Amino acid sequence: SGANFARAFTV
Amino acid sequence: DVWGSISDQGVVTHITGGNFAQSSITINGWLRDFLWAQASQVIQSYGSSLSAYGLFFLGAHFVWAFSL
Amino acid sequence: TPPQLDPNTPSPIFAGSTGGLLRKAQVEEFYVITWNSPKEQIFEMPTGGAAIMREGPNLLKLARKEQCLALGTRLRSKYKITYQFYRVFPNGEVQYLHPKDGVYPEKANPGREGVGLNMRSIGKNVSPIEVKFTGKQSYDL
Amino acid sequence: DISGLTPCKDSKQFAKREKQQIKKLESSLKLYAPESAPALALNAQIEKTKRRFDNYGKYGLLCGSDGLPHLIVNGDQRHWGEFITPGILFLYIAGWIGWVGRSYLIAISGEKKPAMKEIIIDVPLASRIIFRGFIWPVAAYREFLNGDLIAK
Amino acid sequence: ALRFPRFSQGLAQDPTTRRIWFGIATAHDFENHDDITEERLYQNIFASHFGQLAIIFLWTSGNLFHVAWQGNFEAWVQDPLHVRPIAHAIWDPHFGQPAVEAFTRGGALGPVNIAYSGVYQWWYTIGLRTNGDLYTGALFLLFLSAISLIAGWLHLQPKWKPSVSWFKNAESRLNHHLSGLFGVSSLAWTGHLVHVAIPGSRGEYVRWNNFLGVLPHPQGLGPLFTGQWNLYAQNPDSSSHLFGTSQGTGTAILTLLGGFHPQTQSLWLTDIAHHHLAIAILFLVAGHMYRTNFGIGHSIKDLLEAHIPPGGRLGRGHRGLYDTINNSIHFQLGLALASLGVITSLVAQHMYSLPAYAFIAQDFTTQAALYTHHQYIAGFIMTGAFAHGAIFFIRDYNPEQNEDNVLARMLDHKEAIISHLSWASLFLGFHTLGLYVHNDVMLAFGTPEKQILIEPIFAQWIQSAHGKTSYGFDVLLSSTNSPAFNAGRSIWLPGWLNAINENSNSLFLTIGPGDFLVHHAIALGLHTTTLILVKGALDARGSKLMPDKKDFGYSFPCDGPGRGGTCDISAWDAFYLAVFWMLNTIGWVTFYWHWKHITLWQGNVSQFNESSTYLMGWLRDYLWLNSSQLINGYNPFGMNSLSVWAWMFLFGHLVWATGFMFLISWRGYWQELIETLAWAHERTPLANLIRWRDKPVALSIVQARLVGLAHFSVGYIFTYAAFLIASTSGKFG
Amino acid sequence: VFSAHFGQLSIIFLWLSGMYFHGARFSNYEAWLSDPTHIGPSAQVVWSIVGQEILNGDVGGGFRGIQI
Amino acid sequence: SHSVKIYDTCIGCTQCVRACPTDVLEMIPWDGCKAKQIASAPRTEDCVGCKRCESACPTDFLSVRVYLWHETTRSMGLAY
Amino acid sequence: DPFIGSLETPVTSSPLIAWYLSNLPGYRTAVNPLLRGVEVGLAHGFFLVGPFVKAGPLRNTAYAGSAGSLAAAGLVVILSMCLTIYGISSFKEGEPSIAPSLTLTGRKKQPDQLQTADGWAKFTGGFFFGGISGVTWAYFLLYV
Ligand code: CLA
Ligand code: CLA
Ligand code: CLA
Ligand code: CLA
Ligand code: CLA
Ligand code: CLA
Ligand SMILES: CC1=C(/C=C/C(C)=C/C=C/C(C)=C/C=C/C=C(C)/C=C/C=C(C)/C=C/C2=C(C)CCCC2(C)C)C(C)(C)CCC1
Ligand code: SF4
Ligand code: SF4
């Protein structure tokens, strides 16, 4: 679930 | 009269205490126990994760006043 | 033209409706429209529904002048039929109403008097202060 | 200093509010794993809050009694950038827009049916007109002196 | 000529039900009556004035008598701070036992009504101490009403009927009103204050029986005629004086102390007497300006004709304005209404910061009610001024006789005025709404420090100039050394500075970033209402959509669906639209005042200063927070004395919601419904023996608009009054 | 009418595909599957542009996002 | 009964006569224009105030004007 | 006649319904209005007595019957006043009656005398007397 949230904050 | 919480012992505590049967027979009861009491969470949501709901609450009022 | 009469003309075939005459017909007045149809055909009543008009002379009763004129103009536009309507009082007096000169008003005919003609532009009327404290009105002059 | 105000780098309510916000963020930070993405996001939020407070302190604003900064539109020389410096900038940009639009209208007044050019813009002439607004004050002043700004 | 509307045959001929409505509506419009002339109109106006005076006098007599009979004035005067005034008794067959038990307040033996009008303090200050005085006043006002009615009937008689030329004698009327109506009345009130009120404040009872055997000042009239007037100010009242008794008193009757009485926080009576004396002297001197039968004075027409600027920048100037003003009554009505509205607003703004009645600053509900009432009256009057100006432009304006004077030049360039008013309103609304929404969003996201807060520098500088030292500026009166401070220090500054620099009173309250936005909103409301009214007044004679608007009259429904459709095109519709904006602006002003003063009274002023910068603050910390006690007037568990206020709250809500009927739905649907209902009634048995006399028809368009507006106003007023009174009475602070 | 119906069907299918892709990519469905009673569903994540990141409430299961 | 007045700006296009739903207007010969005819309103007492005649009138401002006045059973359009 | 604003339906024109409606006191013609008014008032008062004595503010006390009967009497008085006002305002003194003078068959009949000043006055007096009598009779029957 962490990766899905991190997908928005990649930049 | 339906939703609520249940304990291990077995008693049921409803959300609003089951006051619909005695307070909903007057217009004052609908204005005070329903509109006034249940709007606390909408207006006191500033600074929290539900602020967009308060913003839309105010925006809808603005649009309703605009329509006149 | 001499006004005509409507002695014993029959009526179209109808089943009845609640948009007919009322107490005003017994008290004040009503209107009677007469025309002539070459064939038995179905038309639509101003009050509501559909009726059938017979061949020969046809006569109908209505409550207001607008209904008579609307039915007559529908007849003129769609069926190409001439028509004429009168006004009837409770006392039995009959007054001829539609074309008084025998010609429809849309066409000019000599022998017609001018009524309510102002020989000036609409912007030459006097101000209301000029006509104050008297019964006359600015546009009446 | 002015109207009984306190400099924003000396007041205490500013620091108290900063501490309250930082503690509120750190309360939610503890819930997640330190290496997880939400932890990185919350750390970024904390860094942004600290930078914003430091910049506000260093910029020479004036907090009030309750602890928030107050803007001065009076005209004092120590607050040139509070209202007056941005405002002029706005006018410039704003004037640009207006000027450009006016020019385009005149550029389509010659033709017989300008409505077609109003509802369907053309790009070449508009692109020619767009960059003429960079010097709008000079052209506007010259037109005002000449007298072509006002219809007769 | 035969039916009820005897003053109009056209309204009597038609058989529908609109005859009754329009007969009631146009009873006072004396210009449209058939066979009317100038003399009859003027005489009817005179008689109506007399009737109105009689009604006012009867009203005040009834108030006095009821307070005397069913009140507790005698028990109140002894303990002003711990007794609730009583208006009148309550008798009601519908009342239950708990209602009788709960409404018994004060020292009475039954239900009563607490008086929030504030007449108790006024009557106490002017020098009334027992119920005999109130009964005497009631009898006197009854006599005044009777003589007013008698005079009206007498002047309607053929023998004592005045002529038109008498009514147009402007100079004599102005002289008598400026000298006799104003100056002499102020002189007589000064006499009363010197003779009765001031001695009654020091314990001496002066009445009709023995006012000849007492001396208001031990010296007498000697100083006044000698020239040493200063003897009337030698011994002022001490700072420890107690109202209504003879402890720590003085003998002066005319002073210039300034400030407030220490115990009662009200203005000194000597200052009031001195002010009235000076005003009376000024009016008496100024009332001899105009020419009359004695061969000296000024002529108004020559004064007007001579004020024309060389160079023709104003055109013909003021030539021909005298006859225009004199021959038209709507011009006079508009001027009078505008002046009265400005004066009413001045009264509302002054009576809350410089109270003149004893023990009125400690009564919060009375202050709030009086302020709100006077502001609403002022708003209505100001709207009426523009309405009558538009009526004048429609009816009484003669274009030929006012050529090239100021009125013609005004009609020439309406477009510029309208455009600039529109620009100002757009600017103010755009930026005020933007700032409010930005602050609201910044608070919503959880970061208050990113707010936009602008200090009202100019107003704070004004307050510092007046003598306030709470900001830091040292200008004029604030500075220790200054020509103004030196000039005024010896007379009134010592008291004025002490009064203004305290924190309890309401004189020049401290202001911050919250007041800036509210003041700008008030300015926006004023500008928009002025735009609407001015457009309606100027476009009355004609426009491009309909260039012959003067022929149809002041009020007419529309001009058909042609030319794109023309609804609400008359000036009456402009007034009907401007009423809403007037109500909205007055509501904003009253909300601001009430919240500021309630936060001040409750003890903490930080709540307003921190929650007035965003709209959710107004919605949550003002209405929702303060409605808690009001909505709990009656509940399933029981009820208390606040029940009637909750009932009136709901009543106002219902009326306001009912107004939407007439304001939204229009005529045709209802006319068809009436058609069907008429058929149904005519076709039923045992009920067709009864027949109607007037054919039922639906209401007209203008009538429906008027009814909807009336419902809107009634609901608005009642709801706000109930909320204000209940919320301020619940906490009494 | 036939062509308009086909266009409407295409729009509906696109909307359904978007909902499914949001459920697949930015969601905590797998966390909710194991413990459904104590986890609030969420399938929308807000960017961090202005200060709107406070809209990413803690629904549960090691995730932050708008509850659906 | 309302008041219908015809001014001299008319050009005789016969539109107002056709538009009337109650047969109020008519046309008479004239000599002040090219069409050599003008309008007239004899049967004014039948007018209902619908203002359809004013909707179909080509002129800078209308050459036929209807002013509303005292109402009655015929002009109000009551069928009962 | 189809063009009259009415319809012929089983309920409107039925033998049973017409017979029942033609026997009511308000629809007789040859009878002087006083007796019909008396009958109508008796029926209306006896009907009206009930709800006031049953649902009034004093229904739970020992004063139910008297208060209800007094309220019914007040309602009867107000109705009589309304009838008198309508009769004064509608019909004139010397003018003949305005009732229809021919029936469905077309046979001429004497116009009803109710639609006249004197006839309506007699009807109102009879209604008042009958209403008072019915109210007092209902009170006597209920609580004796
Ligand atoms: C094209 C440029 C343009 C210009 C130069 C003006 C100029 C003016 N406007 Mg107008 N106006 C415009 C467009 C324009 N307007 C549009 C599109 C509208 C409809 C929304 C209005 C509606 C309007 C009102 C309601 C009022 C004015 C007024 C005014 C005057 C006062 C300034 C102000 O209040 O602005 C007001 C500005 C606005 C409310 C919005 C303008 C912003 C538009 C969108 C920008 C122009 C963009 C355009 C699409 C560019 C195309 C060119 C491109 C193809 C190359 C001033 C003469 C005021 C007045 O009368 O003063 C005497 C006033 O009351 N204007
Ligand atoms: C001026 C306004 C005024 C008003 C608003 C009231 C109001 C009231 N009166 Mg008071 N009263 C007044 C003057 C007034 N009074 C005067 C002058 C007297 C001396 C006769 C009294 C003596 C009085 C008594 C003896 C009683 C009341 C009572 C009452 C209450 C019930 C109403 C009623 O029964 O009327 C009663 C009214 C009267 C018998 C006569 C007053 C009528 C005067 C003569 C004229 C009013 C005219 C009016 C302005 C019409 C103008 C029309 C214009 C708009 C076109 C009510 C609070 C009753 C109460 O105590 O209930 C709790 C009651 O018992 N009043
Ligand atoms: C010197 C004698 C004289 C006097 C006393 C008056 C007085 C008056 N005339 Mg005038 N008049 C005169 C000469 C005089 N006239 C002459 C010679 C002519 C012929 C040219 C006229 C022509 C004339 C006409 C044609 C009419 C009058 C009218 C009136 C009345 C005005 C209405 C009203 O009461 O307002 C009250 C006025 C005042 C009290 C002034 C105060 C206003 C300021 C703003 C007060 C500020 C308020 C202050 C704080 C008060 C506190 C409130 C309190 C509750 C605490 C009043 C009786 C009108 C009328 O009513 O007739 C019956 C009217 O129709 N007059
Ligand atoms: C100083 C006194 C004053 C005077 C003498 C006049 C004089 C005049 N006015 Mg002006 N006017 C005034 C103040 C005044 N006005 C004010 C303050 C306003 C702003 C509201 C106006 C706005 C105005 C308008 C808009 C109009 C006039 C018109 C008129 C003329 C006709 C009067 C009439 O027919 O109304 C008689 C009116 C009524 C009896 C019916 C209305 C009553 C209201 C709606 C009652 C509200 C209901 C009530 C409060 C319910 C309470 C319920 C309870 C639960 C509380 C008359 C010459 C009319 C005109 O056309 O003149 C040429 C016109 O249309 N006036
Ligand atoms: C609260 C609702 C409301 C609002 C906001 C307005 C607003 C306004 N009134 Mg209206 N009015 C109302 C109710 C309201 N009225 C009612 C109940 C009546 C009684 C019938 C009237 C009667 C009335 C009259 C008689 C007049 C006005 C006029 C005006 C304007 C005054 C100038 C100004 O304030 O500009 C401030 C501008 C704004 C606050 C408008 C909102 C700006 C929006 C939010 C910006 C767009 C942003 C965003 C991107 C939107 C995108 C949309 C989305 C689909 C993409 C303004 C448009 C006056 C006028 O026209 O002056 C020129 C005038 O003549 N009003
Ligand atoms: C907010 C209040 C409101 C109210 C009360 C009404 C009321 C009503 N509407 Mg309206 N309406 C409204 C707003 C409102 N409307 C709005 C906003 C719109 C949108 C434009 C409409 C549009 C509309 C339409 C399109 C229609 C109606 C119709 C109806 C009627 C339905 C029949 C009935 O229930 O009446 C009975 C009365 C009530 C429920 C109101 C309360 C009365 C209580 C019992 C108090 C009685 C008190 C007592 C008698 C007082 C006497 C004392 C006195 C002598 C001093 C009724 C008159 C319908 C209709 O006319 O068909 C029948 C219909 O066709 N309305
Ligand atoms: C439509 C019309 C009309 C109407 C109008 C109006 C309604 C108006 C209004 C107006 C207004 C409503 C105005 C107002 C004004 C005001 C002013 C002008 C003020 C001033 C002030 C001052 C100047 C002050 C000063 C001061 C100060 C600030 C402080 C202290 C000191 C002193 C005193 C110096 C008429 C009738 C004419 C007729 C025609 C048409
Ligand atoms: S429509 Fe107008 S222009 Fe044409 S004939 Fe009639 S009045 Fe004349
Ligand atoms: S208003 Fe209507 S009815 Fe009257 S003349 Fe014109 S078209 Fe005919």
Contacts with E436 from chain B: Cβ below 8 Å: none
Partner chains of H (3+ C-beta pairs under 8 Å): C, E
Kindly calculate the radius of gyration of chain D based on its CA atoms and give it in whole angstroms. Answer: 26
Q: Which of H36, H90, H97 to mutate to test the interface with E (most CBs of E within 10 A)?
A: H90
- The experimental method, as deposited, was cryo-EM
Query: Which residues in E333-490 belong to E strands, given as ranges?
Result: none
Phi–psi pair at E99, nearest 5 degrees:
-65, -40
Distance CA E379, CA E387 (A): 13
Burial class (CB in 10 A: 0-12, 13-18, 19+), D71: middle
Residues in the ligand 6 pocket, defined by CB under 6 Å: E 657-658, 660-661, 664-665
Q: Angle at CA B24, nearest 5°, toward B20 and B27?
A: 155
Contacts with B23 from chain E: Cβ below 8 Å: 635-636
Distance CA H97, CA H108 (A): 15
Letter for the amino acid at G15? Q
Letter for the amino acid at B39? A
Burial class (CB in 10 A: 0-12, 13-18, 19+), E596: buried
Q: Please give the DSSP secondary-structure letter assigned to residue D132.
A: G
Entry field: residues in chain C: 141
**Nearest ligand, CA of residue E345?**
7
Residue E512, SS3 per DSSP:
coil
Shortest Cα distance from B45 to chain F (angstroms)? 12
Q: Judge: F54–B50 Cβ closer than 8 Å, yes or no.
A: no
Alpha helices (H) in E28-130, listed in sequence order: 38-70, 73-78, 97-103, 119-125
Q: What is the edge-to-edge ordering of all strands in the sheet holding G3-7? A: C117-118, G3-7, G64-67
Q: Are the CB atoms for E378 and E341 separated by under 8 Å?
A: yes
Distance CA C35, CA E436 (A): 73
Quick one: closest CA in F to E442, which residue?
A: F51
Shortest Cα distance from F17 to chain B (angstroms)? 26
Distance CA D127, CA D115 (A): 19
Mutate to test the pocket of ligand 2, among E66, E119, E134, E149 (most ligand atoms within 8 A of CB): E66
Quick one: closest CA in C to G41, which residue?
A: C115
Q: Are the CB atoms for H69 and H53 separated by under 8 Å?
A: yes
Strand partners for G5: G65
Give the Cβ contact number of residue E177 at 10 Å: 13
Query: Cα(G33) to centroid of ligand 8, in Å?
Result: 12
- Residue minimizing CA distance to atom 15 of ligand 7: E342
Q: Judge: B32–E620 Cβ closer than 8 Å, yes or no.
A: no
Distance CA F6, CA D17 (A): 58
Q: Judge: C66–G77 Cβ closer than 8 Å, yes or no.
A: yes
Using the atom order of ligand 6, give the atom closest to the CA of residue E664.
Answer: 20
E473 touches chain D (CB under 8 A): yes
**Which of E148, E127, E169 is closest to E51 using CA atoms?**
E148
Distance CA E238, CA E257 (A): 11
Distance CA E202, CA E244 (A): 6
Annotated binding site of E: 28, 52, 59, 66, 70, 88, 91-92, 94, 113, 117, 122, 155, 166, 172, 175-177, 189, 195, 229, 274-276, 288, 292, 298, 307, 318, 350, 357, 373-374, 388, 409, 413, 420, 423, 431, 438, 458-459, 463, 466, 519-520, 527, 558, 567, 653, 661, 669-670, 711
Residue E422, SS3 per DSSP:
helix
**Which of E540, E559, E536, E623 is closest to E587 using CA atoms?**
E623
Residue D8, SS3 per DSSP:
coil
Contacts with A1 from chain D: Cβ below 8 Å: none
Contacts with C11 from chain H: Cβ below 8 Å: 3
Two tokens at D102?
A: 């006016």
Count Cα neighbours of D131 within 13 Å in the Cβ-side half-sphere. 5
Given resolution (angstroms): 3.3
G53 touches chain C (CB under 8 A): no
Q: What is the 3-state secondary structure (H, E, C) of E427-454?
A: HHHHHHHHHHHHHHHHHHCCCHHHCCCE
Quick one: closest CA in C to G78, which residue?
A: C64
Strand partners for E514: none
The DSSP secondary structure of E262-278, one letter per residue, reads TTT-S--HHHHHHHHHH
CA D148 to chain centre: 33
**Which of B42, D51, A2 is closest to F65 using CA atoms?**
A2
Q: Judge: F53–D38 Cβ closer than 8 Å, yes or no.
A: no
Any residues with CB less than 8 A from the CB of D54 and at least 6 apart, and which? none
Letter for the amino acid at D64? G
Q: Judge: D44–F48 Cβ closer than 8 Å, yes or no.
A: yes
- Residue minimizing CA distance to atom 10 of ligand 7: E338
Strand partners for D33: none
Q: Which of B30, B38, B46 to mutate to test the interface with E (most CBs of E within 10 A)?
A: B46
E445 touches chain F (CB under 8 A): yes
Shortest Cα distance from H87 to chain E (angstroms)? 10
Q: Are the CB atoms for E303 and E295 separated by under 8 Å?
A: no
Contacts with C69 from chain G: Cβ below 8 Å: 21-23
Distance CA E192, CA E186 (A): 10
Shortest Cα distance from H8 to chain C (angstroms)? 9
Using the atom order of ligand 5, give the atom closest to the CA of residue E433.
Answer: 39
Distance CA E483, CA E495 (A): 19
Q: Judge: B51–F54 Cβ closer than 8 Å, yes or no.
A: yes
Count Cα neighbours of G12 within 13 Å in the Cβ-side half-sphere. 15
Distance CA D6, CA D58 (A): 14
Q: Judge: H89–E693 Cβ closer than 8 Å, yes or no.
A: yes
Entry field: residues in chain A: 11
Decide: E180 in ligand 3 pocket, CB within 6 A.
Answer: yes
Annotated binding site of E for [4Fe-4S] cluster: 558, 567
Give the Cβ contact number of residue G80 at 10 Å: 20
Handedness of CA D7, D12, D15, D20 (dihedral sign): negative
C26 touches chain H (CB under 8 A): no
| Buried residues in E151-172 as b, exposed as e (16+ CB within 10 A) | bbeebeeeeeeeeeeebeeebe
Give the largest Cα separation in chain F, rounded: 49
Residues in the ligand 2 pocket, defined by CB under 6 Å: E 55, 58-59, 61-62, 65-66, 88-89, 91
Residue E553 vs residues E391, E394, E549, E661, G67: alpha-carbon distances, Å: 9, 7, 7, 27, 10
